[PDB]
Amino acid sequence: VQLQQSAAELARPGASVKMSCKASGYTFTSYTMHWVKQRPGQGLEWIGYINPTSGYTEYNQNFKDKTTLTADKSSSTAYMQLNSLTSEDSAVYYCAREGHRVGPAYWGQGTLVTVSAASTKGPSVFPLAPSSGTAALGCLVKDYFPEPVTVSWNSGALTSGVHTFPAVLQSSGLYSLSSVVTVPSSSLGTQTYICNVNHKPSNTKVDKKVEP
Amino acid sequence: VQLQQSAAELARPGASVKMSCKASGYTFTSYTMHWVKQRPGQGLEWIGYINPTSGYTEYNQNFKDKTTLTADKSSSTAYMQLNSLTSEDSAVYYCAREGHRVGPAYWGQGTLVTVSAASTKGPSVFPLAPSSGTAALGCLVKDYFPEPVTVSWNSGALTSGVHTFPAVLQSSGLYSLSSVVTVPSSSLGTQTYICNVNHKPSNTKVDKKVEP
Amino acid sequence: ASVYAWNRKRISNCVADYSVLYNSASFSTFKCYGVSPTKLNDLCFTNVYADSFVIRGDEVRQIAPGQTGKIADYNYKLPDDFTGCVIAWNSNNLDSKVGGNYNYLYRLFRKSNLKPFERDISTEIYQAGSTPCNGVEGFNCYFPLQSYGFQPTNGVGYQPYRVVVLSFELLHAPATVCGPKKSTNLVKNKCVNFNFNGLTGTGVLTESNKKFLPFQQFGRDIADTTDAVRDPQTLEILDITPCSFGGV
Amino acid sequence: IVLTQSPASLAVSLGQRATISCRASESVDNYGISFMNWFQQTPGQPPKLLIYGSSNQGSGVPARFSGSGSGTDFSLNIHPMEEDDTAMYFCQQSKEVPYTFGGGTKLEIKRTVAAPSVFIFPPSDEQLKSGTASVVCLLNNFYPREAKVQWKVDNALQSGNSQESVTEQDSKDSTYSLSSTLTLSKADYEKHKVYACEVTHQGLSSPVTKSFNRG
Amino acid sequence: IVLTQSPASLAVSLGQRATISCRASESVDNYGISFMNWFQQTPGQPPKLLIYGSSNQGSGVPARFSGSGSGTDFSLNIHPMEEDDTAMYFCQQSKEVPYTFGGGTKLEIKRTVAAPSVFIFPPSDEQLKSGTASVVCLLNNFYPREAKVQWKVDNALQSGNSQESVTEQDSKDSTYSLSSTLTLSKADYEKHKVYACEVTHQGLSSPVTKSFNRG
Ligand SMILES: *[C@@H]1O[C@H](CO)[C@@H](O)[C@H](O)[C@H]1NC(C)=O
């Protein structure tokens, strides 16, 4: 039993999102298809289910107006349509197959829908230099859209003690995070430290040298 | 349910002791009151019980002759009368309340009755100097009556490694104990060690300087 | 409630639905005496009693007709006849606390075994010895009640069990409590199998001139055979006549 | 049906019992069987069926996980706690048409209380050129995650102007890391001299301050 | 009724089972219930009811303590032994009018056998002015408490002249301390030169002697 989904769709508020779930490993005509919403770092909310054989769809009361479930048995695929998107709709949606008397029994990976009117913007990397045993340093990444960004130290040469904190969504609509590392006080003047920040959506490859 | 007795009464052989037990937290008219004798560091011996509402007292065979139980319901108190005291009578007595089908169920603190013809005498503190890594020293308290005495080092400045052994009753009728402490060998010549002995009953405050 | 003071709820004038008994997963014992458990939805009862309490698990066997033990003798006794059902389920998760749950009590001491369906909530001091107690607690004077002392880590035997006892009263008298059964229409001049509020028979239902007083619900002729009945929905008196039979 | 999940944040050392409890507003039992399900979700992964029904175990589930209970009260127990058990555990009901999940319990492995390594980072010169100043307070290797960070600009407490992030528990160190950024305009940043971060934590007897003067 | 309390001195490490047994001369069972009670007494405190009846637990008693048995044989078991369990445990009977208690069991936490640190102390000069001489032999940090101390004055063993004291088990070190004092008149003390304290203990392969010559 395998379920495959779309990948990280981004839409502005008011638009509609069409979401697909390919099914394999079973008949797909004998098990109903459920959908579950999960806001990042939050609880799970059941959206609704569809019977593949007969298009009888039952939705949650909250999601009844803005959601539409459909299915194509010919290609063995299910679809969820989200209409009139708002910022609350930004979340990970899962498609699940019925089993063991559980509604959403077998889940398929998960696809992230991001609702925002913002546009892609390159990150700015700013050196958080050590303050004048073990010292701390790093660099702060600010004003980039969207997630994710890959942060490394000296192309992977400095990995122990490296903490790249998850970004937080600012009120301006962008993301800011910090990558920090603790280094011996002896290597303050000798060892060169560079943080490498790679943002694929904006194709921004920035290599920032941090010095004390 | 709380029971409160007298505090550490001393009497000479042949005299009589009146012992009180105030009761609170219950009606005191629905539960019989038991008395239990305990020698220091020994087993428990049940003495006898009294019914508060009706003065029906039942005593142990051993304690029948020398013990009398009475009760005052007006003040919610019980009393034990010990007559013709001997050295065997020196012990801690407890007043207990019936409960859970146990005779002496709920005990109250405990009052120590000390039978002796001796009189209050000030302690004498004798410095046990270190013998000429870690060395040992201390001071011996001899011929004090009665217990207890507070022993400290440098007004509490030397607490680790301190052993103030419990006093023992000598054949002469007094008490002797020893306070010892282990000190570094490098501290033999420099640090001053003084043991403080406090005997409140005799109002004896002695500060003994122990030197090697 | 504690077994010594067991809760009694009287049940009457209702449409009895026993779906809770069949759908629940928690029940451990579902014993029935005088009735069949699956047939409870096809019966009409004059009155029902639901007696609920909390007991120790090893004592659940004592909740049954003609049994002996501390609970049966001094706490809760079932009559030898007892048309009804005993339903008990483990409640360790709900009625046990870290430390001890001492709210639930049972009666250790009593002068004599209590009669069936008798409740003793008195807490007078029990006189086990010859000496009168006069309300005090002493050597042979004991508080009659004793705490179960439920703790989560106890043998299934010593874990609390919640018990509900249903006491049906089954008689030809007008039954207030009935299953839904979806009552149907009635026909007059045909041999039918009629179920009149618990009364059941095979005959023709002719219109009757019997003058029933308002409290009267059915009529019995000589030799005590039901010959008349009033239907609950319409309140009309119908004569019941056996449809013709005879040797050939 | 509303499911309330007691403890929703449980810290137990390896080899110790872990209990997550679910209570339902109405009965979940139906047709004789029970319809309470336990799901497990490791970070970055879809939820996986752990315990279908009250006690039945799902496909490929180790014997450590056990489900018990009935009526409205259910419990999930993991006695041989392992490293792989660090996940978010949900309780879900399948009796009624609207399927509802529990609050969720993030299960963490417990360790000894550790002192946070506190540091303060002034804004970079290049950032100061851009008219923005972000000052960072960093806590390295502290357990548990319970800690409070306050910003003091010229001995005046700030509110509604700091954004903090917590990196997930370390795989080996089992210690959290925290980073709080205070953002200001350049004109406002240059109007004050003393910037301090005051942190209180369980492993600190008294709150630790880290301050710097602009320039 | 006479109660015999098997082991009356039990040493068990933390987290280990501890069993104290009470045996009665005649049956303690009456009216169907049992009347064997277990009391606990911490030093300097009144005895506290642990187990009323054969198995029922007293008020505010942790689940560690358990009472079992019937007839004439009863047992008190403490499987999760803790530090606070160091106390004197008594068994008592409530069946007959003269209530009788057990011998009493002092519960000690077990540790590895430790070598006694032996020291000697001659009488002080001021004491010698008073015509009395007390010679002290001190053993520091030895486990178990089983040890024998003998006084040898001019290679002659002394009897009936030494008084010894034992400090209770240390809260952290869990090691006993001993101090034996030999008292003599000044004329008798000055009539001998060599004074020795000869100690035997489990942790010593051979008995240790500590001696001094007067002067
Ligand atoms: C109750 O009785 C009245 C009078 O006979 C009848 O009109 C009514 O329909 C009955 N109720 C139902 C639910 O049929």
Numbering used by the authors:
A (entry chain F), B (entry chain D): 21 to 152, 158 to 237
C (entry chain A): 348 to 595
D (entry chain G), E (entry chain E): 22 to 236
Extract from the study:
The SARS-CoV-2 surface spike glycoprotein (S) mediates entry into target cells and is a primary target of neutralizing antibodies. SARS-CoV-2 spike is a trimer in the pre-fusion form, consisting of three copies of S1 and S2 subunits. The S1 subunit is composed of an N-terminal domain (NTD) and a C-terminal receptor-binding domain (RBD) that recognizes the host angiotensin-converting enzyme 2 (ACE2) receptor on the cell surface. Spike RBD is flexible, moving between “up” and “down” conformations but only binds to ACE2 in the up conformation.
We then generated Fab fragments of the lead clones and determined the cryo-EM structures of Clone 2 or 6 Fabs in complex with the ectodomain of SARS-CoV-2 spike trimer (S trimer) at ~3 Å resolution. Clone 6 Fab binds to S trimer in three states, one with all three RBDs down (26% of all complexes), one with 1 RBD up (43%) and one with two RBDs up (31%). Within each clone, the same Fab-RBD-binding interface is maintained regardless of the RBD conformations across all S trimer states. The additional contact is achieved by the CDRL1 loop of Clone 6 Fab that protrudes in between the two neighboring down-RBDs, along with the framework region 3 (FWR3) of the Fab that interacts with a nearby side surface of the adjacent down-RBD (left two panels). Clone 6 Fab shields the entire top surface of spike RBD (both “left shoulders” and “right ridge”), whereas Clone 2 Fab has a relative rotation of ~17° pivoted on the RBD right ridge, resulting in a larger contact area there and less contact with the RBD left shoulder. The Clone 6 Fab contains a longer CDRH3 loop, which inserts into the central groove of spike RBD to generate a tighter engagement. As a consequence, this induces a substantial change in the RBD, which otherwise maintained a nearly identical conformation, where residue F486 flips to contact the CDRL3 loop of Clone 6 instead of interacting with the CDRH3 loop of Clone 2. Based on our cryo-EM analysis, Clone 6 Fab binds to spike trimer preferentially with at least one RBD down and effectively skews the spike trimer towards pre-fusion states. We hypothesize that the Clone 6 Fab binding to this secondary epitope of RBD helps lock the spike trimer in the pre-fusion form, which inhibits the spike-mediated cell membrane fusion by historical virus and even the B.1.1.7 variant that has enhanced binding affinity to ACE2 (middle).
